[PDB]
Structure formats: structure tokens, C-alpha cells
Design a protein around this ligand. Structure first.
Ligand SMILES: CCCCC/C=C\C/C=C\CCCCCCCC(=O)OC(CO)CO
Length: 135
């Protein structure tokens, strides 16, 4: 019973964000700034309805979805691609498949203890992020 991801979450680790960005074809100059940043994630969740904001000093990215309902996602100001996205529950893990021109693109997000874990995948690259809840 850990599906409730509501809150504001502050990044404490970001493993292989470089490789994930390179797999998305983010240019070197953009990666050079992006890899340095602490990200914050704000999740406003009402059951299966999610409104999410991921923020930093350099880029912000909002994505809203209902679990089980495919949607068009445009990764504006990130890699600027259009995908068909579907978020599902696997147990209490939120699983997103982003179908489009990059193979094996998606993410998984879940709560463990007082941490929010986010694993971002593109191709053969996995980025593992951990966030600590803000009080
Ligand atoms: C927004 C801050 C970025 C800081 C770096 C800036 C520029 C580097 C460009 C591209 C990298 C791709 C990043 C992908 C991040 C997706 C975040 C996402 O979709 O999370 C899901 C799960 O939480 C949303 O519900």
C-alpha cells in the first residue's frame, strides 16, 4: 500500500544521467550544465491522477497523466521528442513506456521508506535517481 507518491522530493543521487542523456542525443553543451543540477520533483496525486513537475535552475518539465490512459507526450525543453506514453501499475511501482523513435524508452518510479526512486531508461542506458522527501 505504497502507491501514494504525493509530496515534494529533492534529489540526493543521480547515477548515469550522463549516459541516459547521451542516449537521448542531448548535445554536449546541454549535458555539461544538466549533469550538475539538483532536481526537485513535485507530485500532486489523486488516486490514479498524477500532476508532476520536475524542476531545476536550467530546465523544468511538467507531465500529467492518469494511470492506464495512453497520452501524447512531448518532452519539451528536454530532448523535444513526441512519444505515446502509457503509465501502468506493476504492484506499487509506476511504470511508463514511452513508445517512439528511441527503443526501450521509459521510466519506473516508486516509494521505498522515505525515498522516491526513479529509474529512467533509453536504449542500453539506465539512470537511477533517488529523492528524499521534503518536510
Ligand atoms: C527537468 C529537469 C531536467 C534537468 C536537466 C536538464 C536538461 C537535460 C535534458 C534532457 C534530459 C532528459 C531528462 C528527463 C527527465 C524526465 C523526468 C520525467 O519524466 O520524470 C517522470 C517521473 O517523475 C515524470 O513523472
Amino acid at each position: 500500500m505504497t502507491r501514494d507518491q504525493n509530496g515534494t522530493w529533492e534529489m540526493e543521487s543521480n547515477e548515469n544521467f550522463e549516459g541516459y542523456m547521451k542516449a537521448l542525443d542531448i548535445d554536449f553543451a546541454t549535458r555539461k550544465i544538466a549533469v550538475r543540477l539538483t532536481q526537485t520533483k513535485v507530485i500532486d496525486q489523486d488516486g490514479d491522477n498524477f500532476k508532476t513537475k520536475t524542476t531545476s535552475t536550467f530546465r523544468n518539465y511538467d507531465v500529467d497523466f492518469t494511470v492506464g490512459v495512453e497520452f501524447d507526450e512531448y518532452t519539451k525543453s528536454l530532448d523535444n521528442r513526441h512519444v505515446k506514453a502509457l503509465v501502468t501499475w506493476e504492484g506499487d511501482v509506476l511504470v511508463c513506456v514511452q513508445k517512439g523513435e528511441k527503443e526501450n524508452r521509459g521510466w519506473k518510479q516508486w516509494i521505498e521508506g522515505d525515498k522516491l526512486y526513479l529509474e529512467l531508461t533509453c536504449g542500453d542506458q539506465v539512470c537511477r535517481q533517488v529523492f528524499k522527501k521534503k518536510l
